[PDB]
Amino acid sequence: EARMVANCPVLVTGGARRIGKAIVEDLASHGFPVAIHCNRSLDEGEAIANRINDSGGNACVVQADLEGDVRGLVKQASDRIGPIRLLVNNASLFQEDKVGALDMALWDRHFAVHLKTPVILAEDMRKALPEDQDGLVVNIIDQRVWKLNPQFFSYTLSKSALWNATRTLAQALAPRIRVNAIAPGPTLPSERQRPEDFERQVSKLPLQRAPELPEFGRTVRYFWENRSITGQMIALDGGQHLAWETPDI
Amino acid sequence: ARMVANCPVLVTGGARRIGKAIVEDLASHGFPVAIHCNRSLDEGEAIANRINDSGGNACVVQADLEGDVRGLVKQASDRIGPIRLLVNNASLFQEDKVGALDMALWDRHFAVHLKTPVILAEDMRKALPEDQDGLVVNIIDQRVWKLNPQFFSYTLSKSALWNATRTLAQALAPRIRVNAIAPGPTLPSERQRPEDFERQVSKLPLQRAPELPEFGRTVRYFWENRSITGQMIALDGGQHLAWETPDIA
Amino acid sequence: VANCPVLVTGGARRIGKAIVEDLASHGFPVAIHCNRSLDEGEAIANRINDSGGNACVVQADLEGDVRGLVKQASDRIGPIRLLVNNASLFQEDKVGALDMALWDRHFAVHLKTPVILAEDMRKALPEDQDGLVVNIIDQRVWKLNPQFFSYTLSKSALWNATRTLAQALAPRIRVNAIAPGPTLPFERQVSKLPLQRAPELPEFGRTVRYFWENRSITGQMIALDGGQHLAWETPDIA
Amino acid sequence: MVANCPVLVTGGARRIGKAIVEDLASHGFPVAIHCNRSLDEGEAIANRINDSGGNACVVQADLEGDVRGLVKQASDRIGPIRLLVNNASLFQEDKVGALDMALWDRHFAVHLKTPVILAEDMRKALPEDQDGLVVNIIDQRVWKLNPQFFSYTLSKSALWNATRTLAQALAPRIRVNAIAPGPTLPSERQRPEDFERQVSKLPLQRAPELPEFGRTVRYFWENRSITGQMIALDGGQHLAWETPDIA
Ligand SMILES: NC(=O)c1ccc[n+]([C@@H]2O[C@H](COP(=O)([O-])OP(=O)(O)OC[C@H]3O[C@@H](n4cnc5c(N)ncnc54)[C@H](OP(=O)(O)O)[C@@H]3O)[C@@H](O)[C@H]2O)c1
Ligand SMILES: NC(=O)c1ccc[n+]([C@@H]2O[C@H](COP(=O)([O-])OP(=O)(O)OC[C@H]3O[C@@H](n4cnc5c(N)ncnc54)[C@H](OP(=O)(O)O)[C@@H]3O)[C@@H](O)[C@H]2O)c1
Ligand SMILES: NC(=O)c1ccc[n+]([C@@H]2O[C@H](COP(=O)([O-])OP(=O)(O)OC[C@H]3O[C@@H](n4cnc5c(N)ncnc54)[C@H](OP(=O)(O)O)[C@@H]3O)[C@@H](O)[C@H]2O)c1
Ligand SMILES: NC(=O)c1ccc[n+]([C@@H]2O[C@H](COP(=O)([O-])OP(=O)(O)OC[C@H]3O[C@@H](n4cnc5c(N)ncnc54)[C@H](OP(=O)(O)O)[C@@H]3O)[C@@H](O)[C@H]2O)c1
């Protein structure tokens, strides 16, 4: 009876750059109050918020280390824009490791950022969201959870766990809070990818095209706008998870 | 120019219930729409009349989808232009079970749910000019994500449509994308009084049925976000995620 | 084992033959179904019977009416308690060159016939005996690709039916499956499998007996495929 | 040959782990019985094995601490480990809304971190002219997800995910497969009468028998084309389907 965007405060983790920024600015331009979470990118976050507010939107910046104490984060956000109703678990760490050379410190960091904190923030959002309001969690995962391979060993396991948690969180938080996910494919070159590498990779996707940045915010809004959807994921990935031509064929 | 006026739609079984809801959403958004029907000709003509009298572009085409369908796409494209968006909505839903399988009904289930969607998709591909991308949306059933032994041949035929959603997406990439909607309980069934439908809905994880507007919104969501192929959204109130089975109650 | 009569479809050559001869050496009565390989089936049955077993040959075109086949077998070796749906048709087609006659044949041999034979087995199974169906599918149903379009759809449906048959036929009959990889033509392909080795014929009979001997297993599949369904280095990864 | 395939079974002193150890040892495998608390049960099992002419030893280690000497302990006594059964488990309840990360961490340490580390150490110490096998003992619930036992389930689901990616990483020389038990023996919190009612509600209406577990490890060992896969010894539990929205 009150799901208008002005009454749906959003918290986007790692929201000051790249895909997180694209989600923040999409939601803010559609009338959602947005809390831009960041850690290192505070300058960028404040600039985004100032631009939104000067344009007549409603945005704030909140700062927290997602590998430390995140127990005040939802409250820092709700103190500024009201009880968080839509949580986008976007923040990420994407470091390579391999079976045979596993460093468990890096392992722990992947699981902290991609699994522990998203679950904790979902819990905290649920606890603080008034009972007459429904909520939504959107987890940002990775297309590779739908096409497992042995590279990026601990990273992959932590993102796969976030996809597993999307189902079990959805079951646990139903009916009042829905939990869905986005699995990006090659969207913006990683730190290890030259432009040639990103382009060659995109040309090898089944759709031969990268997800465009507007598709991410549109998908969050799609999940918000269709209340029968929970426990589900859209891969914005150019078909990557459906790639199939292996050397044995 | 992917403007909706340049995206003719064919909806099979589009004169009633979910198919009608999809037709009317798309036409209200500026898509030219071909309403396929079989027994519901009067209903389909009334819909198309209302759309055309409103300044839209609609027509009605007839075919028994258990027989020859190889002229159906052309019936539509002769009226509204090359079909660019195919919604395989038509369905037959008749109970059978292991122990008393009648292969005549089995054949009808696979005709409507598998042979026809595949043939129409290929016919759409052959007639759609190479400089236009296309979309197929298959309407399946939440149960393909939570297999059970009821409605035996119906279920196998719908599961096959979900399988074909993936291999069609792989075959028709990059130019044509193939996605799916898996409905849950949307409207009461035969021998289901509204009280009965409500009691079943209350046992869904989200305790709410998909509403008809969600179907058109989902079709348009697939149309507008070009990185999605081979995927399905269950508009089902969480039904495929139900988990309280007798072994754990 | 002599209490467990077996029907193996397409049992006269290659993988079916290897399953037949394994089970026969372990004391299972076996009915060898075949169509074109009648002389080979009779030769296998003769060796089994000469060596003290109990084998027969039954004939049927599995693209047509198969409703007498289980009884043809049970008339000779007793009510069937182990059904191996091994027979297969493997012809190439693709979207955009679809021949529906071939499509119908793939679905007849891989889906309609396995289900009907399972249905007949269930109706004939004595009350005091449990049963097992083993469907022979294909590793590709665990790594979908668009090649061999109607063949793949029909094998995927057999895998779907393995689950729903298992649900429908419990507790009396368990329904499991084997997903073969490249067993017989090749040599270069195998080196590209993750295990760099092909499944060997003894593994198939060992797997059928494994399913028989462990009664808590239903609705499940083993891929004897050298890891083929786990292949992952696709063009976007290289 | 099984005489040339030394086995390490984590948590092998009781219940399912004991069933696996005794099945393998009685079939000619040298068996390193790992335990932590159940040292008396462990030494007893191995002594009965040895007295019977088998070849068993007991290695002790806390799987949540330094496990980097455990494979060495085993292989010092019975030769380089060729078959690792990651069976050790912790099964404690939590749920969304009251999650304590200390328990969460233990679930992931015993079900994911340690199985992966031990597999890593096995591959390091296995002579290159020998192939190997890892069998992860998981849980049928990874094939029928539900929101109960939240951190436990996530950690078991991770072990199932790792079964695929370890299989891809360690191929061709080492295979990685899994067993997903259903209701086998009542838990520290489940009454026998409740365990029986649960079994009566399984699709097959019977629990796995303890011999099925060792038979399954031996099945994986004897059939060299199998990797990255799991058998659920669960009486059909993961296939149960009649929920209140249908029933
Ligand atoms: N980009 C792609 O092509 C692609 C492909 C597949 C998957 N993905 C997924 O898509 C999402 C967005 O991708 P992206 O490339 O935009 O991500 P990103 O730039 O690599 O990182 C997102 C943000 O996470 C924040 N973060 C990380 N660790 C943190 C910590 N300990 N405390 C607080 N904040 C922390 C950082 O914010 P600060 O900089 O403010 O500290 C960082 O800017 C991620 O979940 C990623 O895994 C992306
Ligand atoms: N409604 C639900 O609660 C629900 C739940 C799960 C899945 N679904 C799926 O959602 C879709 C729509 O549901 P619905 O309840 O609206 O379906 P429906 O009324 O049972 O079927 C839709 C239309 O299919 C057409 N059709 C059937 N057989 C045909 C044939 N041989 N030739 C030509 N057209 C044929 C009929 O058109 P005419 O009337 O013109 O003959 C019918 O109006 C279906 O795919 C259904 O399986 C629905
Ligand atoms: N071999 C492989 O490398 C491989 C790989 C993946 C999957 N598979 C699967 O493993 C199984 C065995 O493989 P395979 O290569 O040995 O199979 P196959 O030789 O192609 O076929 C097995 C038997 O099926 C019977 N059959 C086929 N159509 C029939 C019909 N209309 N009526 C009656 N019988 C019919 C034939 O019996 P007759 O000779 O008596 O006419 C044939 O001998 C099959 O299910 C196959 O799909 C095999
Ligand atoms: N039993 C069932 O019905 C059932 C159902 C589903 C899944 N499972 C799975 O089947 C497997 C065996 O089940 P179970 O019931 O026999 O298991 P269990 O008795 O509950 O535990 C196995 C053993 O793991 C060892 N262990 C645990 N944490 C350890 C640590 N930090 N360091 C060293 N050893 C540690 C313990 O050995 P010590 O006592 O020597 O310290 C314990 O006895 C497990 O993986 C379990 O999750 C069982």
Numbering used by the authors:
A (entry chain A): 14 to 262
B (entry chain C): 15 to 263
C (entry chain D): 18 to 202, 211 to 263
D (entry chain B): 17 to 263
From the paper:
Dihydrofolate reductase reduces dihydrofolic acid to tetrahydrofolic acid using reduced nicotinamide adenine dinucleotide phosphate (NADPH) as the electron donor. While this reaction is catalyzed by the enzyme dihydrofolate reductase (DHFR) in mammals and other organisms, some bacteria have an alternative pathway for reduced folate biosynthesis using FolM alternative di­hydrofolate reductase 1. Here, we present the crystal structures of FolM alternative dihydro­folate reductase 1 from two Brucella species, B. suis (BsFolM) and B. canis (BcFolM). BsFolM and BcFolM are 95% identical in sequence.
The interface interactions are mostly hydrogen bonds and other nonbonded contacts. The tetramers are similar and superpose with an r.m.s.d. of ∼0.5 Å. Each monomer has the extended double-Rossmann fold of NADPH-dependent SDRs with a central seven-stranded parallel β-sheet sandwiched between two pairs of three α-helices. Both the BsFolM and BcFolM structures were co-crystallized with a cofactor (NADPH). The BsFolM and BcFolM structures are in the closed conformation with ordered substrate-binding loops, as observed in protozoan pteridine reductases. Apart from this loop region, the cofactor-binding cavity is very similar in these enzymes. Furthermore, the residues involved in NADPH binding are well conserved. While the substrates of BsFolM and BcFolM are unknown, their substrate-binding cavities are large enough to accommodate the inhibitors identified by rational therapeutics discovery for human African trypanosomiasis and Chagas disease.
